[PDB]
Amino acid sequence: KDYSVASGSVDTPVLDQLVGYYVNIQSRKMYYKDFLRIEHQAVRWAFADIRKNSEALAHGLLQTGLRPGQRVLAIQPCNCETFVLQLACAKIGALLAVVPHHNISADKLRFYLNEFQPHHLIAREWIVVP
């Protein structure tokens, strides 16, 4: 009220590890329990699945040539796999870039390619745009 500063309570615990670590822990604890549901992709995954194919996709990117320093560019429209890519690129430490697809042309695409200078381009063929 008197001065401009605002603070929240500090009693809440803070998680400082990597992402893959909590994925492994949560995969050991609840293995068969559901993680995400998607009807339009027919995706019903457990924590089993998310761990398994997260690091599987990580290896996939490793053999596709990705390295811990460089970037990925991803234009995918509301899939599960952009999240999976979040985890995969987290595991190999590559910076993932997610750009909005709702207004996309050649010019700003080549702007993104100029900016991030990605190793990979995660794209579509037919994408749905308003």
- Asked whether 73 and 120 are in contact (CB, 8 A), the reply is yes
Contact stretch for another protein (CB under 8 A) within 7-15, 53-61, 74-82, 118-126: 7-15
- Asked whether 80 and 43 are in contact (CB, 8 A), the reply is yes
Site string for another protein, 61-90 (x = CB under 8 A): ------------------------------
CB of 73 to another protein, least distance (A): 11
Contact call for residue 103 and another protein (CB under 8 A): no
- Asked whether 61 and 120 are in contact (CB, 8 A), the reply is yes
**Which position among 18, 56, 78, 95 is part of the footprint of another protein (CB under 8 A)?**
95
CA pseudo-torsion sign 32, 34, 35, 39: positive
